Amino acid sequence: LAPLFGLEQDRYMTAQIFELMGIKDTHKYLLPLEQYQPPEPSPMEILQLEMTKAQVENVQASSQKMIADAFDQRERTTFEQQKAADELSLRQEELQFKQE
Amino acid sequence: LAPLFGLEQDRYMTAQIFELMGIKDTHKYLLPLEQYQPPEPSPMEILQLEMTKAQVENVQASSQKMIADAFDQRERTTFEQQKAADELSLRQEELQFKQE
């Protein structure tokens, strides 16, 4: 039942209890809900959220690096195969030329 | 109800209790809210916040380094391909020249 029992209901119950005994409630720290404003977030939680975001971004970057290096290895293998074929062709051509 | 029950309300409640028994309250450590000022932050929390900021910045720098090295690998592969093509062209030209 916590979701239904919000701040306003708790304040109303406390005010009823006070009216039963403490007729006056606004005289002290107790603040009417009308003038209440949400607390300002603290820097600690903000920086913790930023650190979590940075960590998840780092995980994503690591995955991106994995895929990128896989692609780089594929490209390097293809280039090596092409260069080997070209070198073989050049060697055959030179051999034939010198034999002629 | 903690957000509504601020410092002023707590001080007012304590003052009411004292007036019920301890008519005089300002005679000792108790300080009127008018003259109260927020406590000065301690160096420990400041340096902890600085360390957290440094750590998140280091995470961001690690991500930047990952992307930068990925780009560097791409550029190196492109340069290697271009140099291989140029070397093949030069070898073919030299072979044709010497055969002629």
Author numbering:
A (entry chain A), B (entry chain A): 549 to 648
Original authors' sentences:
Escherichia coli phage SU10 belongs to the genus Kuravirus from the class Caudoviricetes of phages with short non-contractile tails. Here we show that the virion of SU10 has a prolate head, containing genome and ejection proteins, and a tail, which is formed of portal, adaptor, nozzle, and tail needle proteins and decorated with long and short fibers. In contrast to other short-tailed phages, the tails of Kuraviruses elongate upon cell attachment. After binding to the host, SU10 tail, nozzle proteins, and short fibers re-arrange to form a nozzle that extends the tail.
The portal protein of SU10 can be divided into the wing, stem, clip, crown, and barrel domains. The wing domain is the largest, and is formed by eight helices and a β-sandwich containing two β-sheets of five and three antiparallel β-strands. The positively charged side-chains of Lys3 and Lys5 from the wing domain interact with the DNA that wraps around the portal complex. The two lysines are repeated twelve times in the portal complex, and thus form a high-avidity interface that is likely to bind DNA soon after the genome packaging is initiated. Anchoring the DNA end to the portal would influence the packaging of the genome into the head and its final structure. The tunnel loop from the wing domain narrows the portal channel of SU10 to 33 Å. However, the tunnel loops in the SU10 virion and genome release intermediate have the same structure, therefore it is likely that a different mechanism ensures the genome retention of SU10. The stem domain connects the wing and clip domains and spans across the capsid shell. The clip domain of the portal complex reaches out from the capsid and enables the attachment of the adaptor proteins.
